[PDB]
Amino acid sequence: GGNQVQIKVLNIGNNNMTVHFPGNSVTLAQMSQTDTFMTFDIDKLTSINISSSGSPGVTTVAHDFEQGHRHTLLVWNPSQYRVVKDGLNQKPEKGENGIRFVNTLNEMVTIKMSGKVYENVTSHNASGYQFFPSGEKQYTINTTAVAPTCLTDFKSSNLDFGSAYTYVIRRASDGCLEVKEFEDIPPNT
Amino acid sequence: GGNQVQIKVLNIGNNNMTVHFPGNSVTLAQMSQTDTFMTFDIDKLTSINISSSGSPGVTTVAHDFEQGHRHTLLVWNPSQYRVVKDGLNQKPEKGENGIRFVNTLNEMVTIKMSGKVYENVTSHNASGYQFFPSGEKQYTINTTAVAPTCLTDFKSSNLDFGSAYTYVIRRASDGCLEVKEFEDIPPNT
């Protein structure tokens, strides 16, 4: 996955804190972290609650987790948090192509390509890159910005070896969707 | 560098735009980008102005750029922009150590290590990782959070091969700075 979210918790406060994930709670001492990234299916990550020892305050986490990515959930007293982006769940294989999408529409866009998802790419913003084996890839774009009758199926060009591309999503002259491809110098990250 | 900033410009609007960098101007047609990442010394990146054809509006990029990182400057009509982080300027060599810093102080912190900089890491926040060859590394931490008389020089432990670490910065019992090292699962990107 693809569809899996990896989360590590790092307690940077001065007391014991608990993060309640669906089906599993982790209590950490101050100045300590979970030894591993815990893995979840995005659809099963319904809510995340954070609490502190003694303090009755329970805080719910703003669902800012991207599938296919690792995150560090920073926690501190009194029930404070910050989600830090830690990059991809998997190291891209030699020869894979990095693809990111840029949304120029006034509504969010979701892109699904070869089992990978770029969810709710905001207006005039870029997603991070995700990596794919070479060759033409089919993908879909779903948004409220265009008529439901508009074409949602697209195809990437013949992806070279180890390249990186930015796919810019815009309105076509007929009012539907169009994608312009740009080659970028490969990311080092 | 290290102390270098890489910037590519991508015009995602519907008209011609100009980006004035110190000593060099780039004019882009709609749906076009600069063919390369232009490189600048952070200290020499005094200001960046963005303008559109016909529209008298000139916008200054007050938004920061991180040294040692690549960026995509997204531009669109009338004089809009967004700085997108594209990762590191250099691909980490096999065996290098990814190191990031977490600031738990109430003031921003700046860390300088082996020619690399982590500038203004905000309160209860993490920097991205930067990579270094193996062995003990000397580093400095400068902040307004502690007395100027406090020790600002630190040393990393004898760091292993391909190992990643998070250095958590906190106030020591004597009122000065203290750093706790955590080993991490190495980042993939």
Residue numbers in the entry:
A (entry chain A), B (entry chain B): 391 to 579
Pull verbatim passages from the article behind this deposition.
Mammals obtain nitrogen via the uptake of di- and tri-peptides in the gastrointestinal tract through the action of PepT1 and PepT2, which are members of the POT family of proton-coupled oligopeptide transporters. However, a key structural difference exists between bacterial and mammalian homologs with only the latter containing a large extracellular domain, the function of which is currently unknown. Here, we present the crystal structure of the extracellular domain from both PepT1 and PepT2 that reveal two immunoglobulin-like folds connected in tandem, providing structural insight into mammalian peptide transport. Functional and biophysical studies demonstrate that these domains interact with the intestinal protease trypsin, suggesting a role in clustering proteolytic activity to the site of peptide transport in eukaryotic cells.
This domain was crystallized and its structure determined using the single anomalous dispersion (SAD) method of phasing using mercury-derivatized protein. The structure was refined to a resolution of 2.1 Å with final Rwork and Rfree of 19.7% and 23.8%, respectively. Analytical ultracentrifugation on the purified ECDs show that both PepT1ECD and PepT2ECD are monomers in solution. This led us to suspect that the head-to-tail dimer observed in the asymmetric unit was the result of crystallization and that the physiological state of the ECD in PepT1 is monomeric, as shown for the PepT2ECD. The crystal structures revealed that in the PepT1ECD there exist two conserved salt bridge interactions stabilizing the interface between lobe 1 and lobe 2, mediated by Asp574-Lys398 and Asp476-Arg490, whereas in PepT2ECD only one equivalent salt bridge interaction is present, between Asp505 and Arg538. Consistent with this analysis, 3D envelopes of the ECD generated using DAMMIF show that PepT1ECD forms a compact shape ∼48 Å in length whereas PepT2ECD is more elongated, approximately 61 Å in length. From this panel of potential ligands we observed binding only for the intestinal protease trypsin with both mouse PepT1ECD (KD 80 ± 0.8 μM) and rat PepT2ECD (KD 165 ± 0.5 μM).
